[PDB]
Design an enzyme around this catalytic site. Sequence first.
Site, PDB file in Angstrom:
ATOM      1  N   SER A 157       0.853  -1.181   0.000  1.00 16.84           N
ATOM      2  CA  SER A 157       0.000   0.000   0.000  1.00 16.84           C
ATOM      3  C   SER A 157       0.891   1.233   0.000  1.00 16.84           C
ATOM      4  CB  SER A 157      -0.929   0.003   1.217  1.00 16.84           C
ATOM      5  OG  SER A 157      -0.208  -0.109   2.428  1.00 16.84           O
ATOM      6  N   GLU A 162       2.570   6.372  -2.747  1.00 18.02           N
ATOM      7  CA  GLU A 162       3.507   7.376  -3.228  1.00 18.02           C
ATOM      8  C   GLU A 162       3.589   7.467  -4.749  1.00 18.02           C
ATOM      9  OE1 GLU A 162       7.653   6.528  -2.255  1.00 18.02           O
ATOM     10  OE2 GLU A 162       6.995   4.497  -1.670  1.00 18.02           O
ATOM     11  N   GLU A 321     -42.390 -17.174  -5.750  1.00 20.46           N
ATOM     12  CA  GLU A 321     -43.173 -17.408  -6.955  1.00 20.46           C
ATOM     13  C   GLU A 321     -42.754 -18.719  -7.612  1.00 20.46           C
ATOM     14  OE1 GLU A 321     -42.211 -15.225 -10.622  1.00 20.46           O
ATOM     15  OE2 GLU A 321     -44.397 -15.046 -10.946  1.00 20.46           O
ATOM     16  N   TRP A 343     -48.615 -11.210  -8.591  1.00 17.46           N
ATOM     17  CA  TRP A 343     -49.860 -11.499  -9.297  1.00 17.46           C
ATOM     18  C   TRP A 343     -51.113 -10.815  -8.752  1.00 17.46           C
ATOM     19  CZ3 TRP A 343     -50.034 -14.708 -13.712  1.00 17.46           C
ATOM     20  CH2 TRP A 343     -48.803 -15.302 -14.049  1.00 17.46           C
ATOM     21  N   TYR A 369     -48.737 -21.182 -15.303  1.00 13.83           N
ATOM     22  CA  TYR A 369     -47.459 -21.835 -15.034  1.00 13.83           C
ATOM     23  C   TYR A 369     -47.508 -23.088 -14.176  1.00 13.83           C
ATOM     24  CZ  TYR A 369     -45.227 -17.715 -17.065  1.00 13.83           C
ATOM     25  OH  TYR A 369     -44.798 -16.713 -17.896  1.00 13.83           O
ATOM     26  N   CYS A 429     -45.486 -15.298 -20.346  1.00 16.97           N
ATOM     27  CA  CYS A 429     -44.451 -14.579 -21.083  1.00 16.97           C
ATOM     28  C   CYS A 429     -43.279 -15.516 -21.353  1.00 16.97           C
ATOM     29  CB  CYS A 429     -43.972 -13.349 -20.312  1.00 16.97           C
ATOM     30  SG  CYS A 429     -45.085 -11.953 -20.448  1.00 16.97           S
ATOM     31  N   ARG A 449     -41.547 -14.623 -25.040  1.00 18.87           N
ATOM     32  CA  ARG A 449     -42.259 -13.979 -26.142  1.00 18.87           C
ATOM     33  C   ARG A 449     -42.389 -12.465 -25.998  1.00 18.87           C
ATOM     34  NH1 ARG A 449     -47.015 -12.026 -24.716  1.00 18.87           N
ATOM     35  NH2 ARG A 449     -47.923 -12.863 -22.785  1.00 18.87           N
ATOM     36  N   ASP A 452     -40.205  -6.963 -21.048  1.00 20.99           N
ATOM     37  CA  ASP A 452     -40.172  -5.612 -20.520  1.00 20.99           C
ATOM     38  C   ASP A 452     -38.742  -5.457 -20.038  1.00 20.99           C
ATOM     39  OD1 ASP A 452     -40.094  -3.345 -18.943  1.00 20.99           O
ATOM     40  OD2 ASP A 452     -41.990  -3.760 -17.922  1.00 20.99           O
TER      41      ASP A 452
HETATM   42  N1  NDP Z   1      -3.497  -7.210  -3.009  1.00 22.33           N
HETATM   43  C1  NDP Z   1      -2.392  -6.803  -3.668  1.00 22.33           C
HETATM   44  O1  NDP Z   1      -2.523  -6.592  -4.894  1.00 22.33           O
HETATM   45  C2  NDP Z   1      -1.131  -6.637  -2.930  1.00 22.33           C
HETATM   46  C3  NDP Z   1      -1.108  -6.896  -1.505  1.00 22.33           C
HETATM   47  N2  NDP Z   1       0.119  -6.718  -0.843  1.00 22.33           N
HETATM   48  C4  NDP Z   1       0.051  -6.941   0.614  1.00 22.33           C
HETATM   49  O2  NDP Z   1       0.352  -5.686   1.228  1.00 22.33           O
HETATM   50  C5  NDP Z   1       1.091  -5.859   2.409  1.00 22.33           C
HETATM   51  C6  NDP Z   1       2.513  -5.218   2.178  1.00 22.33           C
HETATM   52  O3  NDP Z   1       2.322  -3.775   1.886  1.00 22.33           O
HETATM   53  P1  NDP Z   1       2.798  -2.616   2.902  1.00 22.33           P
HETATM   54  O4  NDP Z   1       2.836  -3.030   4.313  1.00 22.33           O
HETATM   55  O5  NDP Z   1       2.121  -1.379   2.474  1.00 22.33           O
HETATM   56  O6  NDP Z   1       4.317  -2.472   2.400  1.00 22.33           O
HETATM   57  P2  NDP Z   1       5.131  -2.425   1.045  1.00 22.33           P
HETATM   58  O7  NDP Z   1       5.199  -3.840   0.552  1.00 22.33           O
HETATM   59  O8  NDP Z   1       4.755  -1.327   0.227  1.00 22.33           O
HETATM   60  O9  NDP Z   1       6.655  -2.098   1.556  1.00 22.33           O
HETATM   61  C7  NDP Z   1       6.915  -0.939   2.313  1.00 22.33           C
HETATM   62  C8  NDP Z   1       8.416  -0.991   2.462  1.00 22.33           C
HETATM   63  O10 NDP Z   1       8.962  -0.894   1.116  1.00 22.33           O
HETATM   64  C9  NDP Z   1      10.005   0.068   1.229  1.00 22.33           C
HETATM   65  N3  NDP Z   1       9.723   1.348   0.517  1.00 22.33           N
HETATM   66  C10 NDP Z   1       8.481   1.857   0.067  1.00 22.33           C
HETATM   67  N4  NDP Z   1       8.630   3.021  -0.524  1.00 22.33           N
HETATM   68  C11 NDP Z   1       9.961   3.304  -0.481  1.00 22.33           C
HETATM   69  C12 NDP Z   1      10.759   4.392  -0.935  1.00 22.33           C
HETATM   70  N5  NDP Z   1      10.207   5.430  -1.552  1.00 22.33           N
HETATM   71  N6  NDP Z   1      12.095   4.359  -0.728  1.00 22.33           N
HETATM   72  C13 NDP Z   1      12.664   3.303  -0.097  1.00 22.33           C
HETATM   73  N7  NDP Z   1      12.006   2.231   0.373  1.00 22.33           N
HETATM   74  C14 NDP Z   1      10.645   2.292   0.148  1.00 22.33           C
HETATM   75  C15 NDP Z   1      10.430   0.152   2.683  1.00 22.33           C
HETATM   76  O11 NDP Z   1      11.323  -0.896   3.077  1.00 22.33           O
HETATM   77  P3  NDP Z   1      12.206  -0.905   4.351  1.00 22.33           P
HETATM   78  O12 NDP Z   1      11.257  -1.172   5.442  1.00 22.33           O
HETATM   79  O13 NDP Z   1      13.237  -1.942   4.195  1.00 22.33           O
HETATM   80  O14 NDP Z   1      12.865   0.473   4.509  1.00 22.33           O
HETATM   81  C16 NDP Z   1       9.067   0.093   3.216  1.00 22.33           C
HETATM   82  O15 NDP Z   1       8.897   0.097   4.644  1.00 22.33           O
HETATM   83  C17 NDP Z   1       1.188  -7.384   2.572  1.00 22.33           C
HETATM   84  O16 NDP Z   1       0.179  -7.872   3.465  1.00 22.33           O
HETATM   85  C18 NDP Z   1       1.099  -7.972   1.196  1.00 22.33           C
HETATM   86  O17 NDP Z   1       0.539  -9.268   1.252  1.00 22.33           O
HETATM   87  C19 NDP Z   1       1.299  -6.313  -1.519  1.00 22.33           C
HETATM   88  C20 NDP Z   1       1.264  -6.073  -2.879  1.00 22.33           C
HETATM   89  C21 NDP Z   1       0.063  -6.227  -3.556  1.00 22.33           C
HETATM   90  O1  UMP Z   2     -42.276 -12.273 -15.986  1.00 24.68           O
HETATM   91  C1  UMP Z   2     -42.629 -11.359 -16.715  1.00 24.68           C
HETATM   92  C2  UMP Z   2     -44.041 -11.039 -16.931  1.00 24.68           C
HETATM   93  C3  UMP Z   2     -44.355  -9.969 -17.780  1.00 24.68           C
HETATM   94  N1  UMP Z   2     -43.398  -9.227 -18.403  1.00 24.68           N
HETATM   95  C4  UMP Z   2     -43.950  -8.130 -19.260  1.00 24.68           C
HETATM   96  C5  UMP Z   2     -43.837  -8.201 -20.797  1.00 24.68           C
HETATM   97  C6  UMP Z   2     -44.946  -7.268 -21.292  1.00 24.68           C
HETATM   98  O2  UMP Z   2     -44.405  -5.920 -21.227  1.00 24.68           O
HETATM   99  C7  UMP Z   2     -46.134  -7.383 -20.304  1.00 24.68           C
HETATM  100  C8  UMP Z   2     -47.116  -8.492 -20.698  1.00 24.68           C
HETATM  101  O3  UMP Z   2     -47.951  -8.036 -21.805  1.00 24.68           O
HETATM  102  P1  UMP Z   2     -48.301  -8.925 -23.042  1.00 24.68           P
HETATM  103  O4  UMP Z   2     -47.026  -9.124 -23.754  1.00 24.68           O
HETATM  104  O5  UMP Z   2     -48.890 -10.193 -22.620  1.00 24.68           O
HETATM  105  O6  UMP Z   2     -49.257  -8.245 -23.890  1.00 24.68           O
HETATM  106  O7  UMP Z   2     -45.420  -7.846 -19.093  1.00 24.68           O
HETATM  107  C9  UMP Z   2     -42.008  -9.467 -18.257  1.00 24.68           C
HETATM  108  O8  UMP Z   2     -41.115  -8.824 -18.799  1.00 24.68           O
HETATM  109  N2  UMP Z   2     -41.703 -10.537 -17.404  1.00 24.68           N
END
Ligand code: NDP
Ligand code: UMP
Lengths: 547, 542
Positions: A157, A162, A321, A343, A369, A429, A449, A452
């Site tokens: 995140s 950033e 229904e 109905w 039906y 219908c 047939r 709507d």
């Molecule tokens: N659902 C998804 O698509 C994704 C989910 N995840 C999940 O997210 C979590 C991990 O994310 P999160 O905790 O936010 O951390 P990140 O994985 O983004 O890592 C943060 C760390 O990355 C480093 N970092 C980030 N920005 C900078 C920068 N500008 N310069 C230098 N280092 C930087 C630092 O490392 P350091 O601490 O060494 O200084 C920092 O503390 C996990 O649970 C993972 O499973 C991760 C990716 C994708």
């Molecule tokens: O389950 C249903 C029942 C009715 N209609 C609609 C179609 C028509 O607009 C109207 C029925 O009119 P007639 O086609 O029978 O004339 O109700 C649906 O779309 N789904």
Amino acid sequence: MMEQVCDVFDIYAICACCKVESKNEGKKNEVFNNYTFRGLGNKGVLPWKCNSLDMKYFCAVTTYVNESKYEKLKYKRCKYLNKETKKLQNVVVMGRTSWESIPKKFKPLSNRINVILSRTLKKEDFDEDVYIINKVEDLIVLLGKLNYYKCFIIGGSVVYQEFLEKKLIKKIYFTRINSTYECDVFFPEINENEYQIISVSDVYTSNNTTLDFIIYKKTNNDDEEEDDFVYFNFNKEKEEKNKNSIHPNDFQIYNSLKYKYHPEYQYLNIIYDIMMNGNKQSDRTGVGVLSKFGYIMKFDLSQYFPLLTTKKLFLRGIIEELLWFIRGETNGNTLLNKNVRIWEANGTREFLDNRKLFHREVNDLGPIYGFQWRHFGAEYTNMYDNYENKGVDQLKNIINLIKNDPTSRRILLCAWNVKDLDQMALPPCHILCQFYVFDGKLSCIMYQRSCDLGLGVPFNIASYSIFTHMIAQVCNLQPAQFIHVLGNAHVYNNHIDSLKIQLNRIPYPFPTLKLNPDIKNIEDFTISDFTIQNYVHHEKISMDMAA
Amino acid sequence: MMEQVCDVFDIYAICACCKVESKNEGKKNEVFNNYTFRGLGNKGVLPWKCNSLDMKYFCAVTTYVNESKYEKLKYKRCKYLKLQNVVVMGRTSWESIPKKFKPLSNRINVILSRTLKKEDFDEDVYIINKVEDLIVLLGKLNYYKCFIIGGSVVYQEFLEKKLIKKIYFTRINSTYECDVFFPEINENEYQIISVSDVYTSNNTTLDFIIYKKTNNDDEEEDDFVYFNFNKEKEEKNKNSIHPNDFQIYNSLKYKYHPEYQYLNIIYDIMMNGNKQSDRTGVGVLSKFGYIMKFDLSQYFPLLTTKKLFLRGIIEELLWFIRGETNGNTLLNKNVRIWEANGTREFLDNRKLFHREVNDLGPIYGFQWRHFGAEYTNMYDNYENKGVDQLKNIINLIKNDPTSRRILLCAWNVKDLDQMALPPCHILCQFYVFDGKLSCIMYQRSCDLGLGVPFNIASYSIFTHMIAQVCNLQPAQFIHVLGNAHVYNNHIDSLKIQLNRIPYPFPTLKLNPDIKNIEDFTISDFTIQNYVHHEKISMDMAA
Ligand SMILES: NC(=O)C1=CN([C@@H]2O[C@H](COP(=O)(O)OP(=O)(O)OC[C@H]3O[C@@H](n4cnc5c(N)ncnc54)[C@H](OP(=O)(O)O)[C@@H]3O)[C@@H](O)[C@H]2O)C=CC1
Ligand SMILES: O=c1ccn([C@H]2C[C@H](O)[C@@H](COP(=O)(O)O)O2)c(=O)[nH]1
Ligand SMILES: NC(=O)C1=CN([C@@H]2O[C@H](COP(=O)(O)OP(=O)(O)OC[C@H]3O[C@@H](n4cnc5c(N)ncnc54)[C@H](OP(=O)(O)O)[C@@H]3O)[C@@H](O)[C@H]2O)C=CC1
Ligand SMILES: O=c1ccn([C@H]2C[C@H](O)[C@@H](COP(=O)(O)O)O2)c(=O)[nH]1
Ligand SMILES: CCc1nc(N)nc(N)c1-c1ccc(Cl)cc1
Ligand SMILES: CCc1nc(N)nc(N)c1-c1ccc(Cl)cc1
């Protein structure tokens, strides 16, 4: 032009984030946004241990290089440096803590130039083939001296914070892990004014969770074989039918996306297509809609539950229904007693009478039906009748065909009983469901047939995707695809403004559907056997903004 | 190292050819091929007189200019030796062009002649005594691309001397009287690299194909690769299908002809299809869920990559419309589509021990006209029994066109077991907009190699029939495929078929006097201008 460092040296960030174990203050009407996914790590490791697919993705992106594009990058960086005249690899930069979280058998990262930021450690403190720098400046210096394709900032995140602070990131390859875990370290909140999402991938399942990949971009402030392409498009109209009435400036976010691979787009594109090219009609005397005919959507149920995320949806009603259908019921009161009003409007005295169902009791929906699923062909009487051993129990027959004749091309469940249409409060219908079984996997096509798009379809996709899971389970199969075929697809005028809004919302990774594993009979499911997990979604939308 | 003119100076040839009529026999050739389309002119003019669409295409192509890509040409040409294109023609040709239209606007008109006076015409209207004199005029002028709107003679020589790079060939699918023709292109010197969508204009279909001279920003680009990170590197069955075979199919750059909707599915199934074995011991490759769309307003989608007969499927359609379920009616007209499904043995295996031979039960026809009635036998009079869906969908289309309930359904769950076999075509749903009819047909089971081809034709015809009896013009026929498969026995045949370039589709003509769905007869149907590759037995067994 004023050259920015991140562009010259192509410095990118790639991460994976999960949802944070919230301190639910008692509001499971939680609000969701992009910041929902901000969990990076816990106690020095990943909050979710491991995810093979994300791992595969990470490796794919950070090791990929295209040697043919190098010379163009070389000239660019060299010109920028005023400097002009064995396999090409990418660079990966990580904090010390991340480096130490990596197992020894994986360090250093293969086929990549590993760079580690640290203050407490120096080159002497490492045995591996790696470059140790103690400040960001030293990376820029390193990059101006190395032959490398791209530089990816892979983590910590602290490191992400950033690099974004110093505005040295050109793009962010962001993985969305759609689940919650304990976290103690988070990804910096992305300033929406500085970064916009430009692409969304397909959704997947890996290690019991759905996930997708998105890309954030730094914001604002043979060729003749291609000419033939120009010709072939000679007889086109220049603008889409309803452009003037719809106006694209409204779909800004929708049109700014390059890759829209998220499955929800199948639904969004259809809406867009109808809005832009739909035919104007008055479906039901007076209302008015824009309509198209014929579309198909496909959803991979093995990879996710396609519940729309661009708006909020609840499924208790459609699930009740569905159970209601399975039980073969047609009694509307059953749903009303469970506070489900789907109905309600179709069972009133007035509605039934207007369907000429003068002798139909209120809320007695008729041979719909449920009745067709269990007794197709029987003579309907009333909703209280016991139709035992009467008609065709399609539901039971499809389950049996799927179990004993999996390759059959006749596994269909049909609700459209031509003979009973007029006795139904509403013709169905959802005409039919057809099943396909291959290599122990069950796919389902549902033909609708009438659709709507704004109000019904979202729920319909859910209902049948669930139904596919249910049938799959009672037949000992894994669900594969839910294929949705739309016949008459329409968008109601009243829904247009609300849909415009929806279209400009970016989908979230889909949720998952879990069924009680003990249920082995289609009829034994109950409401508590269903669970939709990790449903992340946008604010609920009133498709009809009337007041 | 540039030094072979045609590619060097960017010389292209554009034409439009129609089919020729023979006094012996005037239509429906026994054998077709690329040379089928050779008609060029007749008595100083075009054989078809006029075609607005082709006019538009010719104009667009000959006037289109992209200046950003000019210096890439100015660079090498100078290095070899209001941007407009050059249009080289002949005297006979130039004299055919109307008054108001000469010279061709926004174009550098050139002329091949031995008697024309340069002194008489404008300066921006050059002239040349011989072919080779053209190269010269080019090395002096500033154009984009040189188009040989030719003339029989002009085309020929330019081809022999091999000066043509590409030939934008328009295929007018209709027969006209001709006196001048285009030179038979040597399949080994030129090859088709593109085929457009098919269109209808001036009462004929047509399409545009590009013949090629057989030589024989990035920011979001890497992103495309990342998103493909999890996809299979090779195609599932590639190993058993082998692409060296589909060399023409893969050599095509643009495949916009509608037939490719069918061809692409065959390809998709062969390459990614799942292997499955019916309870018959037979094997197939299968996929689930496809959709094809055909614009019936522009053409009749009868496959051209092989030969298709329609008398049978039309009779079957008429048979459905009558509501018949009597298999003998079809056999007595030598339509044997349902023969196998009506034998004593087949019926018995269906457990229809009390069904008469060829009595197919309550299938299609019975469902279209009597859905819900109790089936007895194929000879019974069901008049006024059950729901007449056919009659109903037609009345809905006429009185309530915007209805979303206009469905014709054959999948009667209650009658399935009584049917000789469950229907493959489950339902038809119709859609009406601006006096135009579209139809979706959902097919639960699809034999891609043998069935689908006929299936597309049947329902396209059905769409026209319904449209006409309702006074609507046909729009789209939409085919939804459920279980789409390719029998293993067809693979070699489909490989061959995949390597044939589609010809422009034909058109369907119905007797316009028929206004009732029940009054159509076999003679009321006519397929016109059907050009196709030779027949292919999907099963090369015998
Ligand atoms: N659902 C998804 O698509 C994704 C989910 N995840 C999940 O997210 C979590 C991990 O994310 P999160 O905790 O936010 O951390 P990140 O994985 O983004 O890592 C943060 C760390 O990355 C480093 N970092 C980030 N920005 C900078 C920068 N500008 N310069 C230098 N280092 C930087 C630092 O490392 P350091 O601490 O060494 O200084 C920092 O503390 C996990 O649970 C993972 O499973 C991760 C990716 C994708
Ligand atoms: O389950 C249903 C029942 C009715 N209609 C609609 C179609 C028509 O607009 C109207 C029925 O009119 P007639 O086609 O029978 O004339 O109700 C649906 O779309 N789904
Ligand atoms: N469908 C299509 O795409 C096209 C159809 N056409 C049709 O074709 C017909 C005309 O074709 P066609 O009769 O072959 O004639 P052309 O239009 O090709 O004209 C031929 C004339 O060009 C000149 N010429 C021939 N050889 C040479 C040479 N080596 N150097 C210089 N000039 C030369 C002669 O002019 P001179 O007599 O002065 O010596 C000659 O008579 C028309 O009916 C026209 O409508 C034409 C183009 C395209
Ligand atoms: O009009 C038709 C009728 C049948 N078939 C094919 C599909 C299947 O290959 C076979 C029917 O067998 P089942 O699908 O019912 O098992 O015939 C078609 O493609 N088109
Ligand atoms: C699966 C790991 C992963 N996936 C994605 N999408 N991004 C990342 N930055 C990492 C990653 C996590 C921890 C370390 Cl130490 C290095 C890289
Ligand atoms: C519509 C005309 C047209 N269309 C195409 N596709 N090609 C052509 N070569 C011509 C053409 C025919 C005769 C003259 Cl004189 C000039 C041009």
